[PDB]
Amino acid sequence: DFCLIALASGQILLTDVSLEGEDTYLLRDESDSSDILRMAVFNQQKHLITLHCNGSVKLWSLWPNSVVKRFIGSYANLKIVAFYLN
Amino acid sequence: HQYQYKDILSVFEDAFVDNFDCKDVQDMPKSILSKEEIDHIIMSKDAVSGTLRLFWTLLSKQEEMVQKFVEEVLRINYKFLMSPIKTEQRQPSMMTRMYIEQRDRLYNDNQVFAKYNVSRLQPYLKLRQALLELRPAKNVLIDGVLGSGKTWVALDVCLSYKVQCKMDFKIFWLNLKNCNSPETVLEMLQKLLYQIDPNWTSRSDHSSNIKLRIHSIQAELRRLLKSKPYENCLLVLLNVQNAKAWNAFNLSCKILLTTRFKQVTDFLSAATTTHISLDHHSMTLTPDEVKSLLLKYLDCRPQDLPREVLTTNPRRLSIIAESIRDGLATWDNWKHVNCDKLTTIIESSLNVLEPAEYRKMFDRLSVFPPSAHIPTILLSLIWFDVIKSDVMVVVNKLHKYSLVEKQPKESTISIPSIYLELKVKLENEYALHRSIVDHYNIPKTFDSDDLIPPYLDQYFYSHIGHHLKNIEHPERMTLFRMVFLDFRFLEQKIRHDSTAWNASGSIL
Amino acid sequence: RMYIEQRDRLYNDNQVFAKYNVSRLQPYLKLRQALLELRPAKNVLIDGVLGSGKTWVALDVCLSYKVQCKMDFKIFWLNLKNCNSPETVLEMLQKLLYQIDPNWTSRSDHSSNIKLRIHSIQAELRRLLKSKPYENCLLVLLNVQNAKAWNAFNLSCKILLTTRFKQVTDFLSAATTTHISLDHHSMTLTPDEVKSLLLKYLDCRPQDLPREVLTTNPRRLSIIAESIRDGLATWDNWKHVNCDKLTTIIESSLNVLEPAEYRKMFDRLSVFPPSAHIPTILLSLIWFDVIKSDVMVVVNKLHKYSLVE
Amino acid sequence: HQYQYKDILSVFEDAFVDNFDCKDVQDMPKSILSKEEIDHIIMSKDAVSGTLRLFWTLLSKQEEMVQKFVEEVLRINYKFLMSPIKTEQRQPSMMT
Ligand SMILES: Nc1ncnc2c1ncn2[C@H]1C[C@H](O)[C@@H](COP(=O)(O)OP(=O)(O)OP(=O)(O)O)O1
Ligand SMILES: Nc1ncnc2c1ncn2[C@H]1C[C@H](O)[C@@H](COP(=O)(O)OP(=O)(O)OP(=O)(O)O)O1
């Protein structure tokens, strides 16, 4: 309940203000993740899940990288399908 | 004699460059390379970067690791690369010894690359590009603001083999650090003479005309240099201080410069020379770098790295990094920041100016809240010791000394920097009230009227209240325009967002 | 014969290995290792606190054959013991010139600029040295006193150092040089050694050896050992310990500092009970002649001189 | 003067011997080597045989094929071998 991330083509981390006098602003400008299907956030904020059209895994760090290789790694289009396990 | 892999390894790259890529292989025995290491290498965009950052990592390690690394490649599909490298033993190529010797005579510049530096990539890379090319009359400037580590990037590229072989192992260093008037030039010139040959007879007469005399030496030099083998050499000039001066050494080939002062980098022209600027934002200290540099002084895990981003200048970064490894500032304290060295460097650095004519005038500039822009028209008020157009005359006369004004070139002046600010304690005695107060001159004239007021640019909306800091508080609480809704909104007028429904991506 | 001759010209340093020393092993052994290797631009420091016999371990290894053959029987000794300012350098440099060849014409002009002048010599030297046979030589520098200075002699190959002052061993860096520290506890005077050294002065059976363990520094160990073979202290008395020599050595050894700025300040340090640690915060009280952060400034300004802090 | 690959090719082998094996690569553009050809080579029991029977096959062919073969290695993962062989042109080593 500190920041608020929002972006389209900018890949930038922004700030969220909670009623109260004090507020915060921040600039990020990460490298382009553009044309992702969907986006989420992890619990310890040090990890960032990312998936692409053809598919990929790109990790980022909020504190101011992709391998399709080895097993499987087939060439084809990735769907919206995704989820978290235990 | 026996050489040592990390000595020799840096020699052959091109072969190692072209036909091999790091990303091809992560075998990664963990002692020899950390994970983060190869994590970082592959991120580079091309071999000339990719292959390169490899070496600089290895050569930072103890020989055993490397000693194993030359073996490790064998197990990889391709050993063909490591058979030559095994010609270390009893076979330094009769050339290579020239190199492997000389860099030592270069490291006997000692401190320099002994302990401290972390390379760089971009500024390095452009330079080798140029400095590989130039033919025997040309130049490469290196311009930087105070500190900003030009003298080093200067060296470091001159250390890299493929250069050192291009120029035939003859590289002559000087310092014009003290160069003024004919006399001094003769000295710092005459030294250069001895290094080329240890024979010079005084024979050209000692006739008391100093101006004549050098022009005899400079002759005797000019022939000798371009004459013989010694056909490809480069002088290097560190801290060129006289816009002449330069013309002392013109005779040569392949020379190279470093300069603070604007008037030099202006005096040269892209026709016969190139540039390397270190202010250009792409060139300067990727925040990832600061980690590595700020590391080697503190000798502590990356958890112990500073948070909040201090600055990119290597100078003033060291003083911090150093003050913590020894003196005060706790690494968490620093307001004081070891003023002496910081001062003693910045202080003499200002010694150039006309003291009453000018050095009085910086003292004024402490009026201003840091990092902003200052309207030149506004600047007219402050001094009023010298009058009228001299303002633009001043800034220019000032500006020519490196960013000591720091031109924006629209209806204003810009802070010279943190440094020439950062120094000390405005003093200036009487100045404050009247200078802060009277510089309120603009608004009270306009108070209440129709439509949109003639109110001054983007400076007033910001810091006009700062100037109130020295004024009567009720008199401000009147005109602080907490009260006034008219003026006040016009601040965020200009303020928009690049993106979404919020503030910035452009402006808060 | 080259060897068996030259060590004599080395022993005609006389006193040195004439009577007194008992070798050592560890500090010896590391050094020969390094000093056998280095190629013609390198260094080996030898750092030690006052006394601690660096100048000797310096020699002794340079006496051992397998070295002496590696370097082709050319070894040149100097002392920078008095080296300050350009003038002196020119001297203690110019001497070195004669030993290499007994021909040097003044030909490079006598022009009154001292700064220029050496840089002419230093040239004329640099060529000659690396030029010919004389390809492998080593200078040796005893008691390097100016952090420059050093830069006087840079031109050469294979040189070697000895230094008290911290600021030297800091100024160099492990990149182009190695270290040998004599403070490192493994390096220093196995108590079995003290027996042998303390023997040769007193000339008496091991029953006559001192009991209670006096110290490991060769310096200040001799003064004891010597004061007994001749003067007072009974070998059982010693509180006085021949203060003069002990003083006259330690006294000048402090002569470097700014007297009122600093030498006043040691006088304070006598406050403290020996061998302990002193909180720097506590240190703030004592002087109060110069103020505030200068404390950490002082210790540093002090510390750079070898462990004087 | 200009030399011709099948003239020069036979010179350096050892390099070509050690770090390369025919069996490693059958790309086999059919004009340059018949099937039976490489059918026969790999059957050899060792490099000193293996690498060898290669050359004797090539040198029995018209230069075009070889002229293409020195290019063909490029497309294979390893071109490092063919950069020297491209020092045919204007650089017969004063020995060779
Ligand atoms: N690549 C670098 N890595 C780490 N520290 C550096 C680097 N470059 C410069 N520094 C720091 C360490 C050096 O001790 C410090 C010295 O300042 P320096 O680089 O010589 O400035 P400069 O000489 O290039 O400009 P100036 O003439 O104003 O000093 O700068
Ligand atoms: N191996 C040794 N064996 C016996 N005595 C030694 C030995 N080394 C040094 N000493 C004693 C005897 C010498 O007379 C005495 C001389 O001091 P010295 O060793 O020259 O100190 P040093 O010169 O190395 O450091 P400093 O410059 O402070 O004197 O040291």
- Dump the DSSP string for B328-375: SSTTTT-SSTTHHHHHHHHHHHTTTS-IIIIIHHHHHHTTSPTT-EEE
Nearest to C161 by CA among C182, C188, C187: C182
Residue with CA at minimum distance from ligand 2 atom 18: C53
Choose the closest CB to A27 out of B43, B287, B504: B504
Query: Tokens at residue B305, please?
Result: 């790295």
Q: In this structure, are strands A50-52 and A36-39 parallel, antiparallel, or unpaired?
A: antiparallel
Q: How far apart are CA B379 and CA B392, in angstroms?
A: 10
**Cα maximum dimension of chain D:** 39
Residue with tokens 């080895």: A70
B15–D78: do the CB atoms touch at under 8 Å? no
A6–B508: do the CB atoms touch at under 8 Å? no
DSSP H or E stretch at residue B223 = helix B210-227
C173–B108: do the CB atoms touch at under 8 Å? no
* CB neighbour list of residue B507: distance below 8 Å, 6 or more residues apart: B494, B495, B496, B497
Q: Are B237 and B261 in contact (CB under 8 A)?
A: no
Q: What angle do CA B482, B485, B489 make, to 5 degrees?
A: 100
Chain C contacts to B (CB-CB under 8 A): 37, 39-42, 107-109, 113, 115-116, 119-120, 123-124, 126-127, 154, 171-176, 293, 296-297, 300
Set of chain C residues whose Cβ sits within 8 Å of the Cβ of B322: none
Q: Could you identify the atom of ligand 1 that is nearest to the CA of residue B153?
A: 1
Q: Could you identify the atom of ligand 2 that is nearest to the CA of residue C58?
A: 24
B316 touches ligand 1 (CB under 6 Å): no
Chain breaks in chain A (C to N over 2.5 A) after: 64
B35 alpha carbon to ligand 1 midpoint, in Å?
30
Q: How far apart are CA C298 and CA C262, in angstroms?
A: 8
Q: Give the closest ligand to the alpha carbon of residue B293.
A: 1
Set of chain D residues whose Cβ sits within 8 Å of the Cβ of B83: 19
Q: How far apart are CA B506 and CA B496, in angstroms?
A: 7
From the CA of B18, how many Å to the nearest CA of chain D? 9
Q: How far apart are CA B391 and CA C119, in angstroms?
A: 47
Given resolution (angstroms): 4.4
Q: Cα C79 to the chain's mean position, in Å?
A: 10
Q: How many helices (H) and strands (E) does chain B have?
A: 25, 4
B200 touches ligand 1 (CB under 6 Å): no
Helix axes B150-159, B122-133, angle to 10 degrees: 60
Query: Tokens at residue B360, please?
Result: 């009085």
Residue with tokens 């006098």: A21
Residue with CA at minimum distance from ligand 1 atom 3: B117
* CB neighbour list of residue C61: distance below 8 Å, 6 or more residues apart: C28, C31, C32, C35, C67
Q: Are B364 and B382 in contact (CB under 8 A)?
A: yes
Nearest to A49 by CA among A62, A39, A37: A39
CB proximity B503 to A under 8 Å: yes
Q: What method did the depositors use to determine the structure?
A: cryo-EM
B500–A12: do the CB atoms touch at under 8 Å? no
Sign of the four-CA dihedral C269, C274, C275, C279: negative
From the CA of D80, how many Å to the nearest CA of chain B? 6
Q: Are B156 and B217 in contact (CB under 8 A)?
A: no
Query: Tokens at residue C251, please?
Result: 């006294």
C22 touches ligand 2 (CB under 6 Å): yes
Q: In this structure, are strands B412-414 and B373-375 parallel, antiparallel, or unpaired?
A: antiparallel
From the CA of B43, how many Å to the nearest CA of chain D? 23
Helix axes B485-493, B460-468, angle to 10 degrees: 130
Sequence letter at residue A25: Y
Q: Cα B327 to the chain's mean position, in Å?
A: 26
Query: Tokens at residue C153, please?
Result: 């002699």
- CA nearest to B506 within chain A: A27
B146 touches ligand 1 (CB under 6 Å): yes
Set of chain C residues whose Cβ sits within 8 Å of the Cβ of B328: 293, 296
* CB neighbour list of residue B54: distance below 8 Å, 6 or more residues apart: B22, B41
Q: How far apart are CA B283 and CA B124, in angstroms?
A: 9
Mutate to test the pocket of ligand 1, among B141, B315, B402, B420 (most ligand atoms within 8 A of CB): B315
Q: Are B250 and B139 in contact (CB under 8 A)?
A: no
Residue with tokens 């390099």: D15
Q: Kindly list the partner chains of chain C, i.e. chains with 3 or more CB atom pairs below 8 Å.
A: B
Q: Give the closest ligand to the alpha carbon of residue C217.
A: 2
Sequence letter at residue B498: S
Q: Give the closest ligand to the alpha carbon of residue B111.
A: 1
How many CB atoms are located within 10 Å of the residue B242 CB?
A: 16
Per-position b or e across B413-424, b if 16+ CB within 10 A of its CB: bbbbbebbbebe
C27 touches ligand 2 (CB under 6 Å): no
DSSP track, B262-299: HHHHHHS-TTT-B--BSSSGGGS--HHHHHHHHHHHH-
Residue with CA at minimum distance from ligand 1 atom 2: B117
B503–A7: do the CB atoms touch at under 8 Å? no
